Each structure stands twice: as C-alpha cells, then as structure tokens.
Amino acid sequence: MKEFYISIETVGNNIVERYIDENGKERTREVEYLPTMFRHCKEESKYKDIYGKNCAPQKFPSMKDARDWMKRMEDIGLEALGMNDFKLAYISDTYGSEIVYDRKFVRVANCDIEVTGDKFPDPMKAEYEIDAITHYDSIDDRFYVFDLLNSMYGSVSKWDAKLAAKLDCEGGDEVPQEILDRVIYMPFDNERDMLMEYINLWEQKRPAIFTGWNIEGFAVPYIMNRVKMILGERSMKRFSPIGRVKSKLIQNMYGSKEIYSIDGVSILDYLDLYKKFAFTNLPSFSLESVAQHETKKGKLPYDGPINKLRETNHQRYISYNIIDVESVQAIDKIRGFIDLVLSMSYYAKMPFSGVMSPIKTWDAIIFNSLKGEHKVIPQQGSHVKQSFPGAFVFEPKPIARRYIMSFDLTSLYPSIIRQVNISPETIRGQFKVHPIHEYIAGTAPKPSDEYSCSPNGWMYDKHQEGIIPKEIAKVFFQRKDWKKKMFAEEMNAEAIKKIIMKGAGSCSTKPEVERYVKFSDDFLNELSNYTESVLNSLIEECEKAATLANTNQLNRKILINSLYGALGNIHFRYYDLRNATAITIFGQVGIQWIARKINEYLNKVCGTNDEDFIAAGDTDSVYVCVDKVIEKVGLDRFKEQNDLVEFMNQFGKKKMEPMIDVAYRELCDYMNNREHLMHMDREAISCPPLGSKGVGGFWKAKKRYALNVYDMEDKRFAEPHLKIMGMETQQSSTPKAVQEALEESIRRILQEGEESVQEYYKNFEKEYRQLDYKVIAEVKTANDIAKYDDKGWPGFKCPFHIRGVLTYRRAVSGLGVAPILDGNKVMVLPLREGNPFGDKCIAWPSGTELPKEIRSDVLSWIDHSTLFQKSFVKPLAGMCESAGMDYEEKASLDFLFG
Amino acid sequence: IIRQVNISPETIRGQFKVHPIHEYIAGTAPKPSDEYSCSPNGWMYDKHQEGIIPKEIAKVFFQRKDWKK
Amino acid sequence: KRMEDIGLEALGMNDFKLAYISDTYGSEIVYDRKFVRVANCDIEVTGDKFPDPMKAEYEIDAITHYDSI
DNA sequence: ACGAATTAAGCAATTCGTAATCATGGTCATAGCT
C-alpha cells in the first residue's frame, strides 16, 4: 500500500503533514514546498490555459514571495496564471498517481459530551461543568467513557457495567453486552484531572477525523471554551497537533455558531454530513428521530427533565450518553459515510475538511485533470452577486385530477453543460437575443449552424469541445461503470446465495476472484463445490466490494449534483452570469417546451382540440396524464387495480419514448448543439384505487400536493403509498396525534372517498374530548409577566395566553404555588364562556399541571372545539375544498326526491 | 463595582454554584464563598489582591476627586 | 507571524508607535498649547449644482485658513 | 457556507411609522310592507 496522507497543514513558509507510511505507521513530515506559477506570454509555450494561449512558467523559492508576486501582478492589472492554493499543488506533485488507501489505518474518533445545568447550557460561554464524556476510537475500537462524580451539583455513585447490562425491569439500563465489553470506564473525583486526562488521551491517540452528532454545534465549542476558561489558552491548543486552533463567528440561521477550526485534525460534523449526503427529509433531525427512522432502535424512555436526571439516576445518565454514541456509530456503520468522505478526499486529492465545500473539491479534480493534460488553470475574478431567474414553477391548478403520472430528467444541469458546451473558453461572441416567447414557441428563426446558442444569447462553440463538459463526461462514465459493477456484484451475490440454498460443497480453499465483474455460469458451478464457511466468506468479500461500489457510485452522484452549485458561486474559478443564466433558461425552455408539446400530442391523440392536460409541473418535474387517456379507453377493461396499473405501464411505454425523443430532438436541432443528452423516465404513478370513490391525488398550492403513488421508479408496491409534500402531516407544528389524524384523513380522501371521511370526522370529534389535554391544548412562550397587570387588567393586549396566565395567577391565589416568571413556556387552555375564572382562556407553565383543585374546574370548562377549529378543521376544510370535497355532512332531502 | 468586587483578567479564581437572581436580591441564598470575592453571576475572584484594572481605576478616581474638591 | 504559525503567544505591544513613545520619554510630559500648531480651514465653491468632493469638477472660489501659532 | 483577510465605547427603553390582517360603522342598495 502506497504512502497515503492523513492530514495536511501549512506552518509559515513550510507545509507539514501527517501520513501513513508504507510500513503502516503514522509519521509527520515538514517540507519546504516550492510552487511554480505561470503567466501570459507572447512567445510560444507548450503550457496552454483553457483559452489556448501560451503560458510561460516561473518557479518560485518560497510561498510568501510567490504571494508577493501575485500581489504585484494584481496591482498592475496583469493576469497571473497557475493555481493560487498550494496544499492542493503539494498533494498533486507529492502523489500524481491515484492513491490506494485502507480505511482501517485512518483513526476516526466519535465523541459526545453531556452537561447538566438549570438554564439551557450555552455553547459559547459554557458556564456549567463537564461530567460525562464519551470518546469512541476505531483504531482501538474502544469507548473511553470519562465520568465525573463530585460536581458542584452533588456527588453521585459510580457506574456499574453489569447493572447497566440488566433489563429495565431489574432496574438496569439494557445496554447490549457487546458494547460494555468494548467500554473503558474512567471515574474522576474533581473536574480538572478529567480534562487533563482527556487532553492526554487526545495526545496519545490523535484522531484523523473527529466526528459526532451535532459536534460542531455543541461538543467542540463547549470543550474548547471550558478548557480555555478553566485550564488556559495553552492547554486548549494542546488538542491541535501543531498547536493552532481558531474560532470564527458565523451569523447564519440566528448565528451563535462559533465554528471551531483545529489545524491538523478534520472536523466533519455528522449532522450536516447526513443532511447533505442522504437526500432524506425527516420531520426532525434529532439523533433519536433519525436513529429510530433508520436503525429502528428505540431510545429507552426517561422521566423528568435532563438537568435533574444526573442526580436522580446517574447510572441511567451515563448509559444514555453511551447509547447516544453507539447510535451515532450505528448510523455511520449502516450508511457508510466515513468511507465516503475518505473516497472523496483521496479521489480529488484534497484535505478532508474541504469535502464540505463542493467548489473546493471541483477545483481540485479540475486542476488535477488539467495538469494531466499539461494545462494551467486561470485565476478567479472577484465579482458581486447578481440574482438571476430561477426555476419557472408551473402554476398549480388547485383542482383534484385523480390519476397522475410524474416524471423528470435525471441530472438536468450536467446534461445542459455536456450537450451544449458552457465551458468558459468556448464563448465565440454575442448572439441576437429574441423575447422568450419567440424561443419557446419556435417562432424565432434558427439561431446558427456554425455555433450552438442558448436563450441567454451567447454564442457557444459546437466544433470545439470545452473542458468542463469533458470533466462531466469523465465523471459520468466513471459513475456508469461503477453502477454496472454494482449490478454485476449484486447478481453475483444473489447467485452465490442461491447456490448456498441449493447446498454448499466441501472445499475450504479460497481461490482468486476477479473483482467488479460478472461471474460466469461455469464459475458458479465451480463455486458450488466450496464449503459454506468459504462461500460465506466469499459473499462477505463481495459485500465489501459492493460497499466500495456504493461509496464510488454515490460519490460520483453527489459530485455531479454539486457541479451546478459550484458554477453558480462567484468564488468558483469559472463564474459567469452568462453561463449560469444560459443553463437556467435552457432548463426553463426545455420544460415549458415539453409541457406544450405533451399538450398538443394528447390533443392530437385523443382527438381533443385546444384542450389543456399538463398538470402542476413544479420546477423541472412535470406531471401529466390528468383525466383523459384512462377514460378514453374505459375502466371496464380492469378487473383489478393492478391490471389498470399494467395498462398504465403499457401505454406509457407506447407513448413515452418516441414523443419525448422527437420533442427534445426538435429542441436540440433548433439550438443546433453537438449532441442531445436528455431522457425522460416515468418516476411516480398515482391513481385512485379501482372501484372506490377516493380521489387519489389533489393539489393545494405551490409545492403543496399529495399523490396516491403505486409504482415509484419501477418499484411495484403491494399497498398504496401516500407521497405527501407541503401539508401539516410532515410539519411538526401540530401535535403528533393531530399529525396522525391528518395523515389518516388524507389517506381517506385519496383512497375511498366522502362518506368514510365524514364518518371518521364524526368519530374523531366524538373521541377528541377524552384525549389528554397535554396533547390537545396550546403551548406558547410567556414574557413580560407584569404587562401592566393592574390587578388582572390586560394592559398591553394579552395575546390570549398572557390573559390565561393572569387567570391562572388569580385562580391559584392563596395556594402558594410558584408564580409564573418571564420567558417561561406556558401551556394555555381556553375556558368555556361564562366561566367563574372570568376569562375564556387559562395558561399554566408548560410541563406543569393546573392545581387539581382548580384543574378539575378548568377541565369542566374547555372549548375542545375552538382548538379543533383552529388546528384541525381549517386544514381539512382547505384540503377538501381544494379537491371538490366537503368534510361536513349536508344531509339533504334528495333521498326522498327520487 | 470593579474596585469593590476586585475584578480583572488576572484575578479570576474559579466558579461557584449560581443561584437565580430572585433569591439573591432577597438575601435568602447562602453566602457563595468565605475566602473569595464573589460576583452574582456565579464567579469568584482573588481576595486581598489588586488587579491592573482596579488599580488604574483607583488612580483615575483619585485624580478626578482631587479636581472635584 | 512565525510565532503565530507555531502557536505560542507573543507578548508585548504589537504597535510600535507608542512603544517608542514610552521608550523615548518614560517620565511625564510637560506640554504647551502655544507651541502646537493648530489650523482651521474653510472652503467655498461656486457651481450650478452641489459640488462633489469625489469629483471636484468645479473651481475653488473662496479659501480661508486660520493658524494658531 | 467558506469567501479567508481582515479594524476600534456598551445596553435598555420609548415612540412612531409602515405593512399585514381581522372586526366593523356609515352609508348605499335591495327590497318588503304599508
């Protein structure tokens, strides 16, 4: 295995790096790198930039003098070529060839902390003490758990492993034993020595990647600040291998994100890593929620608040923190993200942290590819941000249209960049711009034959290939090859599993197997003669190859999908208003052209004249097949809903490829581009269940729609799937019971129809009054408790909850209960009219309950209806009127009319 | 206040259990310490020792009060 | 810069102006108002519209300059 | 959301205007009865 680097930093004019040697050990080396730049020259030079002009090289002895030189070219208005960042250049020259790595050697430390405090602990100042630390090391594969007993909040007993092993019935913590065997427990009396030991452990076992759930949001800022304000600045820097740690403040999303940078180790916060590398929009990104959704492992329930949890059940507290760390380890193991980031950083030959910013990775790979072909990259120009039109979202008609077929093209923006060259140097001049209607209707004449054009109106070369589409094509080819290897390994593993089921052989020898290829039938016959142990080992090796294929495949996927985000940023090396506008309007005209063409094609196929059939095609995604094709033929031809789905597939395949083929062929010919790379594919198919009055699919407003999808991307479902977006169901504003009720109502309106919705609404109205008030009342913040109280006078228009606070205060007069303070979360319960309380609402601190003496009275006076019409009746009414339905029975006389 | 609590970047000495202000104003919570000068956000400072900031404050104050007289 | 790159604190004034000031005098400063040259100036420019200091395209018509020494 | 090189007394408070949204009085229009 070749020497691969762990991390790279720059110290002064030198560059230091930690690497894994050829002997499998970690070593640190410092090199006085000598970058070589380039400049525009009049004479010939084999080194050409993307523009093709000659570039004279220039070697430099030091980093600072090179920076001075580029400053000198900057102040004279002369373009200076080469690459600006130098760690990437050092990496490229140091390795050049592709790098082979083993995931075992790189040390990944997965950490979490727990802090107990009355007020919510502040990451920035960290007033409170630290008492629970968990640090999992992969090299040693051990959970170092630092536990502090004697705090300023009261000492507690030790932590017992065998006690935690036992079930909750016996008073334990049900932590699986295999975890405890890998747990090293360190109890500490005072607070300083535990921090010293944590720094010492960090020193002996320096992580290469330091990760954890929301680590950059709490763990790091808290550990750093506590060490700074308890031990001093010198101790805080000991964490950094080169003693260099820095703190920045970012004012995005209410700010308060003191992102800490440690030079020498990579901070790879798992929250955003999962946010951007999973494409899954969970209702809440809490660790418990994601672990439950994916690992299907439930957290042990606990009682009371977190701050008292330490003093109530210390054993439970430490076991919860260890479980948390195990859960983040499990989500990592199943998703396989550390392997992904390793493959990223070693494919693009870049430092680890740069993975977070797509533009850095794209710059790295582009520069490496250009250096492969003796090219030299240009220098980025500093420009202001200018907004350009985004996606022309088709306006939704809020009318239910029963069955719908939704499709969209895969990786549209790279298709734009590839089929029509948008590389920086392929600009051949301006092109006469017409109004958008002329281009969309095809009325405008053909732009040109010599060079291809875009609706922005800039001449793009057809004969000459650019550089950016070259890289996109390379990545696309690699993705296609690795996905083919994925399919080959999948069928190989399936074949070996079938062979094992048929009966394994009696050979314990492991032969060589060619990787990432398709097995032959004779190979399967030979493999059938091996032992079940060796066959299982072969299946395990094939599964590890499949994991490598997963890493590479989704690596290529996300690189492709981040290219466009890279090009749209000013700091990217190839930013241009013209290019981004060209690709965006190209997408817009493409989708609108598809919409109008499918309209006229359905018109000419079904015999309708001037009729409209394109549904609400939000952004690129287009929704078609509203209410015509199925009726034209007849529902009588379907003895089963599955038969209707099969006919759906049949006529979709009949009418999809030639229509879209000729449509996008016309589009590329109109634009006269080098090639066409835009393919449709039926993604989601929704339709009301056969033989039922349910509607299936409706639309409320922009980005608000629910579809009764059946066969999503060629995956037949035994049961309907309610693909819902925009409603209150996924939103967490309403209580979970209300969310379940809303989801059930949606299923009812899309599956069976009116009468069932009516009966469900009636019975839920009947059973709502018996539900707990904790889940069916309001909750709101309370501040400025006085608010010109004036003995119960509202003062400043108490917003229906501070008035309830005043009512609760008046009611509990004489009970001696704790008065309501400023900023407290208070539960509010509207009271029935004419109440002795004197107010049609009451508010008691959230989490607490009204004194049972007065609570019984407030429970007797409740307008369950008010809350019901606020949170539940209004959304149901909006949805039902959005689909031509009525959720309240009218009970007309028509039954006697007939 | 700086001269009284004797607060300065050098004179920090550690932390004590912070009680809410509501029971500090009423004078119900116990004395935070016995050998350190405590500030009611829950901090302690070095007793019988002058920091740089209080010393400069004292000098400027003595000059100002001289001109006052 | 090198000490920052290594990561150890470099103690002392980073600004050398007042460092040289302290090294030069050390003791207290005895000054005199009449020895310090304080100057005031005022400008008037006549033009069709409001003149712009960023452009100064109009001539200067009235100069006045007071000197204290 | 990585631009990357960098910089200079503090906070609590009222009051008014603007933009958004819901409740409603005066008046007009409809109409109905005499």
Short mmCIF file of N, CA, C and O in Angstrom, two decimals, chain A residues 557-652:
data_model
loop_
_atom_site.label_atom_id
_atom_site.label_comp_id
_atom_site.label_asym_id
_atom_site.label_seq_id
_atom_site.Cartn_x
_atom_site.Cartn_y
_atom_site.Cartn_z
N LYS A 557 -22.37 10.46 -7.90
CA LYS A 557 -23.69 11.07 -7.89
C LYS A 557 -23.65 12.47 -7.28
O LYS A 557 -24.13 13.44 -7.88
N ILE A 558 -23.06 12.59 -6.09
CA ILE A 558 -23.12 13.87 -5.39
C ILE A 558 -22.16 14.87 -6.01
O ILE A 558 -22.44 16.08 -6.01
N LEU A 559 -21.04 14.42 -6.57
CA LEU A 559 -20.18 15.34 -7.32
C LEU A 559 -20.94 15.94 -8.50
O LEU A 559 -20.91 17.15 -8.73
N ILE A 560 -21.65 15.08 -9.24
CA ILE A 560 -22.43 15.54 -10.38
C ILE A 560 -23.49 16.54 -9.93
O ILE A 560 -23.68 17.59 -10.54
N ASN A 561 -24.18 16.23 -8.83
CA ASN A 561 -25.25 17.10 -8.37
C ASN A 561 -24.75 18.37 -7.69
O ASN A 561 -25.54 19.29 -7.49
N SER A 562 -23.47 18.43 -7.32
CA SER A 562 -22.90 19.64 -6.74
C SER A 562 -22.17 20.51 -7.76
O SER A 562 -21.81 21.65 -7.44
N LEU A 563 -21.92 19.99 -8.97
CA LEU A 563 -21.32 20.81 -10.01
C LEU A 563 -22.09 22.12 -10.22
O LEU A 563 -21.48 23.20 -10.26
N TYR A 564 -23.41 22.04 -10.37
CA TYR A 564 -24.17 23.25 -10.66
C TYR A 564 -24.07 24.26 -9.52
O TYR A 564 -23.92 25.46 -9.76
N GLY A 565 -24.17 23.78 -8.28
CA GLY A 565 -23.99 24.67 -7.15
C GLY A 565 -22.61 25.30 -7.13
O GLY A 565 -22.44 26.43 -6.66
N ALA A 566 -21.61 24.58 -7.63
CA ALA A 566 -20.28 25.16 -7.75
C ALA A 566 -20.25 26.28 -8.79
O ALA A 566 -19.73 27.36 -8.53
N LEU A 567 -20.83 26.03 -9.97
CA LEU A 567 -20.77 27.02 -11.04
C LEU A 567 -21.54 28.29 -10.70
O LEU A 567 -21.22 29.37 -11.22
N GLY A 568 -22.55 28.19 -9.84
CA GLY A 568 -23.35 29.35 -9.51
C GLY A 568 -22.76 30.27 -8.47
O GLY A 568 -23.39 31.27 -8.12
N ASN A 569 -21.57 29.98 -7.96
CA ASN A 569 -20.94 30.78 -6.93
C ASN A 569 -19.89 31.69 -7.54
O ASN A 569 -19.17 31.29 -8.46
N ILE A 570 -19.80 32.92 -7.02
CA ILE A 570 -18.86 33.89 -7.57
C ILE A 570 -17.42 33.45 -7.34
O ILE A 570 -16.55 33.69 -8.19
N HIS A 571 -17.14 32.81 -6.21
CA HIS A 571 -15.77 32.43 -5.88
C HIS A 571 -15.27 31.24 -6.67
O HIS A 571 -14.08 30.91 -6.59
N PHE A 572 -16.14 30.56 -7.42
CA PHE A 572 -15.69 29.48 -8.28
C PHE A 572 -14.79 30.03 -9.38
O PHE A 572 -14.96 31.16 -9.85
N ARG A 573 -13.83 29.20 -9.80
CA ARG A 573 -12.82 29.64 -10.75
C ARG A 573 -13.39 30.03 -12.10
O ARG A 573 -12.71 30.71 -12.88
N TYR A 574 -14.62 29.62 -12.40
CA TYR A 574 -15.21 29.82 -13.71
C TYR A 574 -16.60 30.42 -13.59
O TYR A 574 -17.53 30.04 -14.31
N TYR A 575 -16.77 31.38 -12.68
CA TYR A 575 -18.05 32.04 -12.53
C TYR A 575 -18.33 32.95 -13.71
O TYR A 575 -17.43 33.57 -14.27
N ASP A 576 -19.61 33.02 -14.09
CA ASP A 576 -20.05 33.91 -15.16
C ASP A 576 -21.56 34.03 -15.08
O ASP A 576 -22.26 33.02 -14.97
N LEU A 577 -22.06 35.27 -15.13
CA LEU A 577 -23.51 35.47 -15.21
C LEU A 577 -24.07 34.83 -16.46
O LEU A 577 -25.13 34.20 -16.43
N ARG A 578 -23.36 34.97 -17.58
CA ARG A 578 -23.86 34.47 -18.86
C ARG A 578 -24.04 32.96 -18.83
O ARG A 578 -25.06 32.45 -19.30
N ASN A 579 -23.08 32.23 -18.27
CA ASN A 579 -23.15 30.77 -18.29
C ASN A 579 -24.30 30.26 -17.42
O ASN A 579 -25.09 29.41 -17.86
N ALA A 580 -24.40 30.76 -16.19
CA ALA A 580 -25.47 30.32 -15.30
C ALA A 580 -26.84 30.69 -15.86
O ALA A 580 -27.77 29.88 -15.83
N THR A 581 -26.97 31.91 -16.39
CA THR A 581 -28.23 32.31 -17.00
C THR A 581 -28.55 31.42 -18.19
O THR A 581 -29.70 31.00 -18.37
N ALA A 582 -27.55 31.11 -19.01
CA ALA A 582 -27.78 30.27 -20.18
C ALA A 582 -28.31 28.91 -19.78
O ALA A 582 -29.31 28.43 -20.33
N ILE A 583 -27.68 28.27 -18.79
CA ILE A 583 -28.12 26.93 -18.42
C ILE A 583 -29.50 26.97 -17.76
O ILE A 583 -30.35 26.11 -18.01
N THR A 584 -29.76 27.99 -16.92
CA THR A 584 -31.06 28.06 -16.26
C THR A 584 -32.19 28.27 -17.26
O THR A 584 -33.21 27.57 -17.22
N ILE A 585 -32.03 29.23 -18.17
CA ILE A 585 -33.08 29.45 -19.16
C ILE A 585 -33.17 28.27 -20.12
O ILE A 585 -34.26 27.98 -20.63
N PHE A 586 -32.07 27.57 -20.38
CA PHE A 586 -32.16 26.35 -21.18
C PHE A 586 -33.08 25.34 -20.51
O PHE A 586 -33.96 24.77 -21.15
N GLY A 587 -32.90 25.14 -19.21
CA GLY A 587 -33.80 24.25 -18.49
C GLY A 587 -35.24 24.72 -18.55
O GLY A 587 -36.16 23.92 -18.75
N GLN A 588 -35.46 26.03 -18.38
CA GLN A 588 -36.82 26.56 -18.38
C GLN A 588 -37.50 26.34 -19.73
O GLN A 588 -38.64 25.86 -19.79
N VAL A 589 -36.82 26.69 -20.82
CA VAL A 589 -37.42 26.50 -22.14
C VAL A 589 -37.61 25.01 -22.43
O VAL A 589 -38.59 24.62 -23.06
N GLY A 590 -36.70 24.16 -21.94
CA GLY A 590 -36.89 22.74 -22.15
C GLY A 590 -38.15 22.22 -21.50
O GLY A 590 -38.95 21.52 -22.13
N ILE A 591 -38.38 22.59 -20.23
CA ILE A 591 -39.54 22.05 -19.54
C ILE A 591 -40.83 22.64 -20.10
O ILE A 591 -41.83 21.93 -20.27
N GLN A 592 -40.84 23.94 -20.43
CA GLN A 592 -42.05 24.53 -20.99
C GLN A 592 -42.34 23.97 -22.39
O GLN A 592 -43.51 23.77 -22.75
N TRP A 593 -41.29 23.71 -23.17
CA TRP A 593 -41.46 23.07 -24.47
C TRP A 593 -42.06 21.68 -24.31
O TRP A 593 -42.97 21.30 -25.06
N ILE A 594 -41.57 20.91 -23.34
CA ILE A 594 -42.14 19.59 -23.10
C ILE A 594 -43.61 19.71 -22.72
O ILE A 594 -44.44 18.94 -23.19
N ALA A 595 -43.95 20.70 -21.89
CA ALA A 595 -45.34 20.88 -21.47
C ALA A 595 -46.24 21.18 -22.66
O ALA A 595 -47.29 20.54 -22.84
N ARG A 596 -45.86 22.15 -23.49
CA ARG A 596 -46.73 22.50 -24.61
C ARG A 596 -46.82 21.35 -25.62
O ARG A 596 -47.89 21.09 -26.18
N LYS A 597 -45.70 20.65 -25.83
CA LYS A 597 -45.72 19.53 -26.77
C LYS A 597 -46.59 18.39 -26.27
O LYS A 597 -47.31 17.77 -27.07
N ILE A 598 -46.53 18.07 -24.98
CA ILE A 598 -47.39 16.99 -24.49
C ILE A 598 -48.85 17.41 -24.55
O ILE A 598 -49.73 16.59 -24.84
N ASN A 599 -49.13 18.70 -24.32
CA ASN A 599 -50.49 19.19 -24.53
C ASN A 599 -50.97 18.91 -25.95
O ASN A 599 -52.02 18.29 -26.15
N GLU A 600 -50.19 19.33 -26.95
CA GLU A 600 -50.66 19.16 -28.33
C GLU A 600 -50.66 17.70 -28.75
O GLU A 600 -51.51 17.29 -29.55
N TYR A 601 -49.73 16.89 -28.22
CA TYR A 601 -49.72 15.47 -28.55
C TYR A 601 -50.95 14.77 -28.00
O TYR A 601 -51.57 13.95 -28.69
N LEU A 602 -51.33 15.07 -26.75
CA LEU A 602 -52.56 14.50 -26.22
C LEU A 602 -53.77 14.98 -27.00
O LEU A 602 -54.71 14.21 -27.25
N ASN A 603 -53.76 16.26 -27.40
CA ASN A 603 -54.85 16.78 -28.24
C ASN A 603 -54.99 15.97 -29.52
O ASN A 603 -56.09 15.55 -29.89
N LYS A 604 -53.88 15.75 -30.22
CA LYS A 604 -53.93 15.05 -31.50
C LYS A 604 -54.15 13.55 -31.34
O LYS A 604 -54.60 12.89 -32.29
N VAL A 605 -53.84 12.98 -30.17
CA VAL A 605 -54.01 11.55 -29.97
C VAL A 605 -55.45 11.23 -29.58
O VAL A 605 -56.07 10.33 -30.16
N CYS A 606 -55.99 11.95 -28.61
CA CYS A 606 -57.34 11.68 -28.13
C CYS A 606 -58.42 12.43 -28.91
O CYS A 606 -59.60 12.30 -28.58
N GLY A 607 -58.04 13.20 -29.93
CA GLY A 607 -58.99 13.91 -30.75
C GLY A 607 -59.48 15.22 -30.17
O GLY A 607 -60.28 15.90 -30.82
N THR A 608 -59.04 15.59 -28.97
CA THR A 608 -59.45 16.85 -28.38
C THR A 608 -58.77 18.02 -29.09
O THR A 608 -57.67 17.90 -29.63
N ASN A 609 -59.45 19.17 -29.08
CA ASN A 609 -58.98 20.36 -29.77
C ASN A 609 -58.78 21.48 -28.75
O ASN A 609 -59.71 21.81 -28.00
N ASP A 610 -57.58 22.05 -28.72
CA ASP A 610 -57.22 23.21 -27.90
C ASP A 610 -57.35 22.95 -26.41
O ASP A 610 -57.37 23.90 -25.62
N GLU A 611 -57.43 21.69 -25.99
CA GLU A 611 -57.61 21.39 -24.58
C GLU A 611 -56.26 21.34 -23.86
O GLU A 611 -55.20 21.20 -24.47
N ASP A 612 -56.32 21.47 -22.53
CA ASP A 612 -55.14 21.52 -21.69
C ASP A 612 -55.05 20.26 -20.83
O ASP A 612 -56.06 19.81 -20.27
N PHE A 613 -53.85 19.70 -20.73
CA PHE A 613 -53.63 18.48 -19.95
C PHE A 613 -52.39 18.51 -19.07
O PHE A 613 -52.27 17.62 -18.21
N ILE A 614 -51.47 19.46 -19.23
CA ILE A 614 -50.29 19.50 -18.38
C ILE A 614 -50.72 19.89 -16.97
O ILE A 614 -51.40 20.90 -16.77
N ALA A 615 -50.31 19.08 -15.99
CA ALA A 615 -50.69 19.37 -14.58
C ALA A 615 -49.72 20.38 -13.97
O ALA A 615 -49.10 21.14 -14.73
N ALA A 616 -49.61 20.38 -12.64
CA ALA A 616 -48.74 21.36 -11.95
C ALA A 616 -47.29 20.86 -11.96
O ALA A 616 -46.86 20.28 -10.95
N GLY A 617 -46.57 21.11 -13.06
CA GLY A 617 -45.17 20.65 -13.17
C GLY A 617 -44.22 21.57 -12.41
O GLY A 617 -43.54 22.38 -13.06
N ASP A 618 -44.17 21.44 -11.08
CA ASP A 618 -43.28 22.29 -10.25
C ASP A 618 -41.84 22.13 -10.74
O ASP A 618 -41.44 20.99 -11.03
N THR A 619 -41.09 23.24 -10.85
CA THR A 619 -39.67 23.21 -11.32
C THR A 619 -39.53 22.27 -12.53
O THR A 619 -40.41 22.30 -13.40
N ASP A 620 -38.43 21.51 -12.59
CA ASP A 620 -38.18 20.61 -13.75
C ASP A 620 -39.22 19.48 -13.78
O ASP A 620 -39.69 19.16 -14.89
N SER A 621 -39.56 18.92 -12.62
CA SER A 621 -40.51 17.78 -12.58
C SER A 621 -41.80 18.16 -13.31
O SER A 621 -42.34 19.24 -13.02
N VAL A 622 -42.26 17.31 -14.23
CA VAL A 622 -43.52 17.59 -14.99
C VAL A 622 -44.55 16.50 -14.66
O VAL A 622 -44.17 15.31 -14.66
N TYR A 623 -45.79 16.90 -14.39
CA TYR A 623 -46.86 15.92 -14.04
C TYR A 623 -47.87 15.91 -15.18
O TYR A 623 -48.38 16.99 -15.55
N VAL A 624 -48.14 14.73 -15.75
CA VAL A 624 -49.06 14.64 -16.93
C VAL A 624 -50.09 13.53 -16.68
O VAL A 624 -50.13 13.02 -15.54
N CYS A 625 -50.89 13.18 -17.70
CA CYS A 625 -51.95 12.15 -17.56
C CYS A 625 -52.93 12.58 -16.46
O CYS A 625 -52.84 12.02 -15.35
N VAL A 626 -53.81 13.54 -16.76
CA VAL A 626 -54.75 14.07 -15.73
C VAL A 626 -56.04 13.24 -15.73
O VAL A 626 -56.17 12.38 -14.84
N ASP A 627 -56.95 13.49 -16.68
CA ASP A 627 -58.24 12.75 -16.75
C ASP A 627 -58.70 12.67 -18.21
O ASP A 627 -59.58 13.48 -18.59
N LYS A 628 -58.14 11.75 -18.98
CA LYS A 628 -58.50 11.63 -20.42
C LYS A 628 -58.10 10.25 -20.95
O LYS A 628 -59.01 9.50 -21.37
N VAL A 629 -56.81 9.92 -20.93
CA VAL A 629 -56.33 8.63 -21.52
C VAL A 629 -57.11 7.46 -20.92
O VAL A 629 -57.66 6.66 -21.71
N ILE A 630 -57.16 7.36 -19.59
CA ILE A 630 -57.83 6.19 -18.94
C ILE A 630 -59.29 6.15 -19.38
O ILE A 630 -59.76 5.07 -19.80
N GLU A 631 -59.99 7.29 -19.31
CA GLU A 631 -61.43 7.35 -19.68
C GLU A 631 -61.58 7.00 -21.16
O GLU A 631 -62.46 6.17 -21.48
N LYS A 632 -60.76 7.60 -22.02
CA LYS A 632 -60.86 7.36 -23.49
C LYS A 632 -61.04 5.87 -23.76
O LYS A 632 -61.90 5.53 -24.59
N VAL A 633 -60.27 5.02 -23.08
CA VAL A 633 -60.33 3.55 -23.34
C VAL A 633 -61.50 2.95 -22.56
O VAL A 633 -62.38 2.33 -23.20
N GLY A 634 -61.51 3.11 -21.23
CA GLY A 634 -62.60 2.57 -20.40
C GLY A 634 -62.09 1.88 -19.15
O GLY A 634 -61.11 1.12 -19.25
N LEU A 635 -62.74 2.12 -18.00
CA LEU A 635 -62.34 1.49 -16.72
C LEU A 635 -62.84 0.04 -16.69
O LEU A 635 -62.34 -0.73 -15.85
N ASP A 636 -63.79 -0.30 -17.56
CA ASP A 636 -64.38 -1.67 -17.58
C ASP A 636 -63.31 -2.70 -17.94
O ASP A 636 -63.52 -3.89 -17.62
N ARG A 637 -62.21 -2.27 -18.56
CA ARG A 637 -61.16 -3.22 -19.01
C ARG A 637 -60.26 -3.62 -17.84
O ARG A 637 -59.22 -4.26 -18.09
N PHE A 638 -60.64 -3.26 -16.61
CA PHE A 638 -59.75 -3.54 -15.45
C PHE A 638 -60.49 -4.34 -14.37
O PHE A 638 -61.21 -3.73 -13.57
N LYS A 639 -60.33 -5.67 -14.37
CA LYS A 639 -60.91 -6.47 -13.30
C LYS A 639 -60.20 -6.24 -11.97
O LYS A 639 -60.75 -6.58 -10.92
N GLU A 640 -59.01 -5.65 -12.00
CA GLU A 640 -58.25 -5.40 -10.78
C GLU A 640 -57.42 -4.14 -11.00
O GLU A 640 -56.97 -3.86 -12.11
N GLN A 641 -57.25 -3.37 -9.92
CA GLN A 641 -56.46 -2.14 -9.99
C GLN A 641 -55.06 -2.40 -10.53
O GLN A 641 -54.51 -1.58 -11.27
N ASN A 642 -54.48 -3.55 -10.19
CA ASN A 642 -53.18 -3.91 -10.73
C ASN A 642 -53.22 -4.02 -12.25
O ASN A 642 -52.24 -3.67 -12.92
N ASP A 643 -54.33 -4.49 -12.81
CA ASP A 643 -54.46 -4.53 -14.27
C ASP A 643 -54.46 -3.12 -14.85
O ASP A 643 -53.89 -2.88 -15.92
N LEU A 644 -55.11 -2.18 -14.16
CA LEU A 644 -55.08 -0.79 -14.61
C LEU A 644 -53.66 -0.25 -14.56
O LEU A 644 -53.24 0.50 -15.45
N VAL A 645 -52.90 -0.61 -13.52
CA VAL A 645 -51.50 -0.19 -13.44
C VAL A 645 -50.69 -0.79 -14.58
O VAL A 645 -49.80 -0.14 -15.15
N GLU A 646 -50.97 -2.05 -14.93
CA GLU A 646 -50.26 -2.68 -16.04
C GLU A 646 -50.57 -2.00 -17.37
O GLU A 646 -49.68 -1.79 -18.19
N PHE A 647 -51.84 -1.66 -17.60
CA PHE A 647 -52.20 -0.94 -18.82
C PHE A 647 -51.55 0.44 -18.82
O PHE A 647 -51.10 0.93 -19.86
N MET A 648 -51.52 1.09 -17.66
CA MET A 648 -50.77 2.32 -17.48
C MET A 648 -49.33 2.17 -17.96
O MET A 648 -48.85 2.97 -18.77
N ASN A 649 -48.65 1.12 -17.50
CA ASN A 649 -47.28 0.88 -17.94
C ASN A 649 -47.21 0.65 -19.44
O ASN A 649 -46.32 1.17 -20.12
N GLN A 650 -48.15 -0.13 -19.98
CA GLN A 650 -48.12 -0.48 -21.39
C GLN A 650 -48.25 0.76 -22.27
O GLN A 650 -47.41 1.00 -23.15
N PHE A 651 -49.27 1.58 -22.04
CA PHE A 651 -49.41 2.75 -22.90
C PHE A 651 -48.40 3.84 -22.56
O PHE A 651 -48.07 4.64 -23.44
N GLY A 652 -47.87 3.87 -21.34
CA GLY A 652 -46.77 4.77 -21.06
C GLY A 652 -45.54 4.43 -21.89
O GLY A 652 -44.92 5.31 -22.49
#
